[PDB]
Design a protein around this ligand. Structure first.
Ligand SMILES: [Fe+2]
Length: 53
């Protein structure tokens, strides 16, 4: 699975780590994250994230 970065602040979603404090377990593909999830650091939505590549 690929990493995704927040294009507003630079936060990096790493699927191996997930974002467990907000309900996204290690191993979840970004695709599969609930679509109401927001960037844990600046709060913008998933639509500001882009695939790293
Ligand atoms: Fe962000």
């Amino acid at each position: 699975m690929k990493k995704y970065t927040c294009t507003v602040c630079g936060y990096i979603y790493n699927p191996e780590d997930g974002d467990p404090d907000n309900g996204v377990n290690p191993g979840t593909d970004f695709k599969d994250i609930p679509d109401d999830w927001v960037c844990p650091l600046c709060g913008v939505g998933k639509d500001q994230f882009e695939e790293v590549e």
